[PDB]
Amino acid sequence: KDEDIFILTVQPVGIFKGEEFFQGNSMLPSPTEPVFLVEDDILNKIFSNEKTKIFHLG
């Protein structure tokens, strides 16, 4: 009541080492680390494959 508490319970689904994706888990980010919202262009490199085996479902 004195302040406003907005909390999100969120689940990891991977990691970006650098300029690339690496599916995995068991990675614990240290507290106070900043949290951003992902852009759609980054999400497009995920759910995508090589052009020789791309099948657009929707």
Add this chain to the structure above:
Amino acid sequence: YGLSLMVVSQRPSEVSDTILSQCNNFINLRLTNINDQNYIKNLLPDNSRSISEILPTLG
């Protein structure tokens, strides 16, 4: 008489329990079926039940 079995299956719940329950050593890889983890957890030794929660996490 000198025979051994290596039961290799991706669906442990579908294999007959008469053959799997006679296995002493387990080499468990990643399992994603909740009906498969439950069956293999009850077949592992009791000391490894605490560490048997890594099966969906192994990569």
Add this chain to the structure above:
Amino acid sequence: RKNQLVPSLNINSRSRYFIIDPDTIDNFDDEFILFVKDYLDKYNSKIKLHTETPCFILKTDVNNLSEYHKRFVSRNIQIITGYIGDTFYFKEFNKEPKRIIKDNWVEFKARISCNSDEVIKCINYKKCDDLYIVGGVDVSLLDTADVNIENLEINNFRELKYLLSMLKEI
């Protein structure tokens, strides 16, 4: 070279010291402040996870450092020199900045000083973990036995930014 240094730069709490030589890098006077600003905006940014203050040591006269301090003050960057004018106070150079984590306040961001004997002794008193040398400065009396010495050969600040993973291209 960039991928060799990408470890020890991903660690938040880690002391990094620089021995940048103004003569080697061109346009040093007009780009050093911006380079420090973009370094602090990425490395000395978080107030709870970045608990180490970077130290920058320049090979120049003690008089020329006041101009750098004035430029930093004008660009609204809080740094400590340790010099009150031709006089060095070691009790001020080796002080931990005061942090108040309620409004994102820290007393100072970086330590920019000269290459005198007093500042060298102060650095030796509280050794860092990674020591970076730019321009081939005579790093002899630093007791570099514990630190990870990493000489860097560059010609402009763009290459320095690329090496420190602050840029994707040159």
